[PDB]
Design a binder for this molecule. Structure first.
Ligand SMILES: [Cl-]
Length: 97
């Protein structure tokens, strides 16, 4: 238990593929448990977007703003490893890209 993600300002959009269930609160709690700040809005302070089947607007903005765009598996791997894992190993997916 350590604030290994203390430098992360995360914006989270993690949904079921069919867009009926929003799991963003789950992953927000896991990030905050690791010391991260999680912002409710995707503002200029955000350094990381954790993305699963989120809005296309979010996907485009993350790519165009050059933020770290990661899958949920990155959150699970930081937790189980207890370390800030390299985000380039966990690129997010978007089935419509
Ligand atoms: Cl799903």
């Amino acid at each position: 238990a350590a604030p290994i993600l203390k430098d992360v300002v995360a914006y989270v959009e993690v949904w079921s593929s069919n867009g009926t269930e929003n799991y963003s609160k789950t992953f927000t709690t896991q990030l905050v448990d690791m010391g991260a700040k999680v912002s409710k809005t995707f503002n200029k302070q955000v350094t990381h977007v954790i993305f699963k089947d989120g809005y296309q607007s979010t996907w485009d903005k993350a790519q165009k703003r050059g933020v770290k765009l990661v899958s949920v598996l990155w959150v699970e791997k930081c937790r189980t490893a207890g370390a800030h894992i390299d985000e380039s190993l966990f690129p997010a997916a978007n089935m419509n890209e």
